[PDB]
């Protein structure tokens, strides 16, 4: 499927929750590798799905600072899944846009 | 290769405040998914964790000792501490802080201080 | 919240034994279940964490097995640097609790 339709697919809230609790101070992050486990690839479309992941949370972010804090923590994401992070997420320009 | 050095005070008056402060070697304090922390251990007792705290201030303790713990998280000095209030004699032990690690795959202390001895003493 | 409730004090085992160290959550633990090693004088040391997922720097005589509620830690051919007091240590949940404790001896 095309990329956006696979994050469609997957409930990204564990996610959201996840890096949302880091950045203001049953198992979210569990929860959350295991619907970023129910896709056709992860290598790949994995970028749109952490860009997805932060437009579902602009709202709720409030200055660049938090923004560049929610950025480092997406980065980190496929880390926490034993996951391999990908080489092109251009996070910067759609964190500015959204 | 990271390092982290406790400091503080060795003894502490029994009505007072205990503080000791961890100095990261690595500037890894901004880094996600690192919980600095710290755990004690009485003499003739095991491992007792008493907190966490993350670079945003995001923190978890041991609930039996929230009440008197309180953490800070200084990321440019590359330094967090712990404040325990209302020190017993319970609370005589030997401190470590530790670096958690919140994986899937690995939620543990993967580096450990040398450890600070405190005893509460009048 | 989770109770980690240990073996007792291994008994002392002589060299080349099989020495079994036990560790029950009484609320289920899942993956998260990680074993330290402590000598003397030492600060702890990280030495399986998750399930049969041993640390860098680990012995390969190291070996960690158990579903959510029991667990398990095997030292196949005990050697006396293994003096130590073994912890597990869980994070299913964000109340963080350590196990008792098994100190193990060695028969010489």
């Known amino acids: 499927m095309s990329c956006e339709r696979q994050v469609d697919r997957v409930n990204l809230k564990p996610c959201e929750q996840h890096i949302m609790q880091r950045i203001m101070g049953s198992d979210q992050q569990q929860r959350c590798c295991d619907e970023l486990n129910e896709m056709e690839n992860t290598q790949g479309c994995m970028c749109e799905a952490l860009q997805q992941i932060m437009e579902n949370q602009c709202d709720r972010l409030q200055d660049r600072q938090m923004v560049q804090q929610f950025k480092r923590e997406l980065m980190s994401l496929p880390q926490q899944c034993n996951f391999r992070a990908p080489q092109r997420c251009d996070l910067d320009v759609s964190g500015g846009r959204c | 290769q990271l390092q982290l050095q406790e400091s503080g005070p060795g003894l502490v008056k029994p009505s007072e405040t205990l503080s000791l402060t961890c100095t990261v070697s690595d500037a890894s304090i901004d880094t996600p998914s690192y919980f600095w922390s710290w755990i004690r251990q009485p003499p003739g007792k095991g491992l007792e964790w008493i907190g966490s705290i993350y670079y945003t201030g995001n923190k978890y303790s041991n609930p039996s000792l929230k009440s008197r713990v309180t953490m800070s998280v200084d990321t440019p000095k590359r330094q967090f501490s712990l404040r325990l209030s209302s020190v017993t004699a319970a609370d005589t032990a030997v401190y470590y802080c530790?670096?958690?690690?919140?994986?899937?795959?690995?939620?543990?202390?993967?580096?450990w201080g040398q450890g600070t001895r405190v005893t509460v003493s009048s | 919240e989770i109770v980690l409730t240990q073996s007792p004090a291994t008994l002392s085992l002589s060299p080349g034994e099989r020495a079994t160290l036990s560790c029950r959550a009484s609320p289920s633990a899942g993956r998260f279940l990680a074993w330290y090693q402590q000598r003397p004088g030492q600060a702890p040391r990280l030495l399986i964490y998750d399930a049969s997922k041993r640390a860098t720097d680990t012995p390969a005589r190291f070996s960690g097995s158990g579903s959510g509620t029991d667990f398990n830690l095997t030292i196949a051919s005990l050697e006396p640097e293994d003096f130590a007091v073994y912890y597990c240590?869980?994070?299913?949940?964000?109340?963080?609790?350590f196990g008792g404790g098994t100190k193990v001896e060695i028969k010489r």
């Open positions: 240590q869980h994070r299913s949940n964000w109340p963080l609790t």
């Open positions: 530790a670096r958690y690690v919140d994986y899937v795959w690995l939620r543990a202390f993967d580096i």
